[PDB]
Design an enzyme around this catalytic site. Structure first.
Site, PDB file in Angstrom:
ATOM      1  N   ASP A 146      -5.220  -5.963   3.296  1.00 17.15           N
ATOM      2  CA  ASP A 146      -4.694  -5.614   1.990  1.00 17.15           C
ATOM      3  C   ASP A 146      -5.134  -6.571   0.899  1.00 17.15           C
ATOM      4  OD1 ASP A 146      -3.214  -4.411  -0.008  1.00 17.15           O
ATOM      5  OD2 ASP A 146      -1.397  -5.517   0.524  1.00 17.15           O
TER       6      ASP A 146
ATOM      7  N   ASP B 261      -7.873  -2.570  -4.527  1.00 21.30           N
ATOM      8  CA  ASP B 261      -6.755  -2.638  -3.584  1.00 21.30           C
ATOM      9  C   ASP B 261      -6.984  -1.788  -2.315  1.00 21.30           C
ATOM     10  OD1 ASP B 261      -4.314  -2.801  -2.296  1.00 21.30           O
ATOM     11  OD2 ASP B 261      -3.127  -2.116  -4.001  1.00 21.30           O
TER      12      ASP B 261
HETATM   13  C1  LIG Z   1       2.322  -8.570  -4.011  1.00 22.06           C
HETATM   14  C2  LIG Z   1       3.049  -7.301  -3.573  1.00 22.06           C
HETATM   15  C3  LIG Z   1       2.708  -6.117  -4.485  1.00 22.06           C
HETATM   16  C4  LIG Z   1       3.682  -5.617  -5.360  1.00 22.06           C
HETATM   17  C5  LIG Z   1       3.380  -4.533  -6.186  1.00 22.06           C
HETATM   18  C6  LIG Z   1       2.106  -3.955  -6.161  1.00 22.06           C
HETATM   19  C7  LIG Z   1       1.132  -4.439  -5.269  1.00 22.06           C
HETATM   20  C8  LIG Z   1       1.435  -5.532  -4.439  1.00 22.06           C
HETATM   21  C9  LIG Z   1      -0.282  -3.811  -5.238  1.00 22.06           C
HETATM   22  N1  LIG Z   1      -0.797  -3.608  -3.873  1.00 22.06           N
HETATM   23  C10 LIG Z   1       0.000  -2.725  -2.993  1.00 22.06           C
HETATM   24  C11 LIG Z   1      -0.370  -3.072  -1.544  1.00 22.06           C
HETATM   25  O1  LIG Z   1      -0.185  -4.480  -1.358  1.00 22.06           O
HETATM   26  C12 LIG Z   1       0.538  -2.368  -0.519  1.00 22.06           C
HETATM   27  C13 LIG Z   1       0.235  -2.841   0.918  1.00 22.06           C
HETATM   28  C14 LIG Z   1       0.824  -1.889   1.977  1.00 22.06           C
HETATM   29  C15 LIG Z   1       2.188  -1.918   2.253  1.00 22.06           C
HETATM   30  C16 LIG Z   1       2.718  -1.053   3.214  1.00 22.06           C
HETATM   31  C17 LIG Z   1       1.899  -0.150   3.888  1.00 22.06           C
HETATM   32  C18 LIG Z   1       0.533  -0.127   3.622  1.00 22.06           C
HETATM   33  C19 LIG Z   1       0.007  -0.995   2.660  1.00 22.06           C
HETATM   34  C20 LIG Z   1      -0.384   0.860   4.354  1.00 22.06           C
HETATM   35  C21 LIG Z   1      -0.212   2.291   3.816  1.00 22.06           C
HETATM   36  C22 LIG Z   1      -1.063   2.564   2.576  1.00 22.06           C
HETATM   37  C23 LIG Z   1      -0.429   3.670   1.700  1.00 22.06           C
HETATM   38  N2  LIG Z   1      -0.058   3.143   0.357  1.00 22.06           N
HETATM   39  C24 LIG Z   1       0.445   1.850   0.244  1.00 22.06           C
HETATM   40  C25 LIG Z   1       0.802   1.348  -1.001  1.00 22.06           C
HETATM   41  C26 LIG Z   1       0.641   2.109  -2.162  1.00 22.06           C
HETATM   42  C27 LIG Z   1       0.148   3.409  -2.069  1.00 22.06           C
HETATM   43  C28 LIG Z   1      -0.206   3.930  -0.822  1.00 22.06           C
HETATM   44  O2  LIG Z   1      -0.653   5.075  -0.766  1.00 22.06           O
HETATM   45  C29 LIG Z   1       1.280  -0.085  -1.072  1.00 22.06           C
HETATM   46  O3  LIG Z   1       2.337  -0.418  -1.600  1.00 22.06           O
HETATM   47  N3  LIG Z   1       0.352  -0.922  -0.597  1.00 22.06           N
HETATM   48  C30 LIG Z   1      -0.376  -2.484  -6.027  1.00 22.06           C
HETATM   49  C31 LIG Z   1       0.483  -2.618  -7.291  1.00 22.06           C
HETATM   50  C32 LIG Z   1      -0.131  -3.594  -8.303  1.00 22.06           C
HETATM   51  C33 LIG Z   1      -0.669  -2.392  -9.090  1.00 22.06           C
HETATM   52  C34 LIG Z   1       0.261  -1.470  -8.281  1.00 22.06           C
HETATM   53  O4  LIG Z   1       1.864  -2.893  -6.999  1.00 22.06           O
END
Ligand SMILES: CCc1ccc2c(c1)[C@@H](NC[C@@H](O)[C@@H]1Cc3cccc(c3)CCCCn3cc(ccc3=O)C(=O)N1)CC1(CCC1)O2
Length: 355
Positions: free
Chosen positions: A34, A220
């Site tokens: 990630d 991302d």
């Molecule tokens: C520091 C923590 C944080 C907080 C807010 C945040 C982010 C990061 C940015 N990145 C999101 C990303 O870290 C997460 C990771 C993740 C968490 C849980 C499961 C998975 C991935 C795998 C599944 C992927 C499917 N998916 C995950 C996310 C978003 C859309 C989406 O389709 C997600 O939150 N990913 C993305 C943004 C910044 C711009 C939007 O928001």
């Protein structure tokens, strides 16, 4: 870097993961890659969705930091207990490092029922680490403690099983064709970049470029879709709707490849007044469930897997830049291909960023 090729797996829409070991003796876990976060966190309790979890009681090298931690992402969240332990990546460089690890002890909508991963590797910068920027992210620890060069690259290949490569410490030239083109990392928190122009079928969307990066644009690997600010999504959809008038689709929604338009993002280049453009095909943004995988954001542009599956992406932290090249694995037809092209003349590119 042959040993690292094909070290990523996943199921469509559930993220890409790499095998890691944690502790002594080593405990194998599958860990999401990630670039959109900065914490290394692993399931540490027997959540029913988890195949396995970190058992700190079995590790002689475990050290407790006696501090809680909580990370909320777009949709889910976890809280846990900070500590350190020895970590390696079996299909990564031949090294072991002492890293910060959040042992996850409670969660909500974070783990996915039916997925094959048990933790998350935040590869972005300390500024967005929780609880604060003093918690050294994994990659920072890796570079500090070893001779591993300060860069990594990702070839996300897609297909409901998916695959790819994370090359830690280098670039594998067999994973791309043509040249890499680099865009500056605007600030080291997320991997923030600046989009300076957007074309649908080679036709300018004609929006103030500041809208493209309101309030962020980021790269991302943890996000599935190409996410666009609503004012830009609104304009983007409008033009995509027009471009594809041969057929009609219902409002809520928002194989014949040639009917769908390519989408081009022009990114700030390395030189004053110079940009380049990356272009994706319908086979990137029409993902099998097909679902349309461009969506709205209140949090800016997110160049997720929809963008990244077209390209080999180099996270050149050493030089504060991100490289894009056409991926050697991207799906394409006899007619069209994903593209990275330049140089172009673009004026006032520094005005495109939000403050
Ligand atoms: C520091 C923590 C944080 C907080 C807010 C945040 C982010 C990061 C940015 N990145 C999101 C990303 O870290 C997460 C990771 C993740 C968490 C849980 C499961 C998975 C991935 C795998 C599944 C992927 C499917 N998916 C995950 C996310 C978003 C859309 C989406 O389709 C997600 O939150 N990913 C993305 C943004 C910044 C711009 C939007 O928001």
């Amino acid at each position: 870097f042959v040993e690292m090729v094909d070290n990523l797996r996943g199921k469509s829409g559930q993220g890409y993961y790499v095998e890691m070991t944690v502790g002594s003796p080593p405990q194998t876990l599958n860990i999401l890659v990630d670039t959109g976060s900065s914490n290394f966190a692993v399931g540490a309790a027997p959540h029913p969705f988890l195949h396995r979890y970190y058992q700190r009681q079995l590790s002689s090298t475990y050290r407790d930091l006696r501090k809680g931690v909580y990370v909320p992402y777009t949709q889910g969240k976890w809280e846990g207990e900070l500590g350190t332990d020895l970590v390696s990546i079996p299909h990564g460089p031949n090294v072991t490092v002492r890293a910060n690890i959040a042992a996850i002890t409670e969660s909500d909508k974070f783990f996915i029922n039916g997925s094959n991963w048990e933790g998350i590797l935040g590869l972005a910068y300390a500024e967005i680490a929780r609880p604060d920027d003093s918690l050294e992210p994994f990659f920072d620890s890796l570079v500090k403690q070893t001779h591993v060069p300060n860069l990594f690259s990702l070839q996300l290949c897609g297909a409901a099983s998916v695959g790819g490569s994370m090359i830690i410490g280098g670039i594998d030239h067999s994973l791309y064709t043509g040249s890499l083109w680099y865009t500056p990392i605007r600030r080291e928190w997320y991997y923030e970049v600046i989009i300076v122009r957007v074309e649908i079928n080679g036709q300018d969307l004609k929006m103030d470029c500041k809208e493209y990066n309101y309030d962020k644009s980021i790269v991302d690997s943890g996000t599935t879709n190409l996410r666009l600010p609503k004012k830009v999504f609104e304009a983007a959809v409008k033009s995509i709707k027009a471009a594809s008038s041969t057929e009609k689709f219902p409002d809520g929604f928002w194989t014949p490849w040639n009917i769908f338009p390519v989408i081009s993002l022009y990114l700030m280049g390395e030189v004053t007044n110079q940009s380049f453009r990356i272009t994706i095909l319908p086979q990137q943004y029409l993902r099998p469930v097909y679902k349309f995988a461009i969506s709205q954001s209140s949090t800016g542009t997110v160049m997720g897997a929809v963008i990244m599956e077209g390209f080999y992406v180099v996270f050149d932290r050493a030089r504060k830049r991100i490289g894009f090249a056409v991926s050697a694995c991207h799906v394409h037809d006899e007619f069209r291909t994903a593209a990275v092209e330049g140089p172009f003349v673009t004026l006032d590119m520094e005005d495109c960023g939000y403050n």
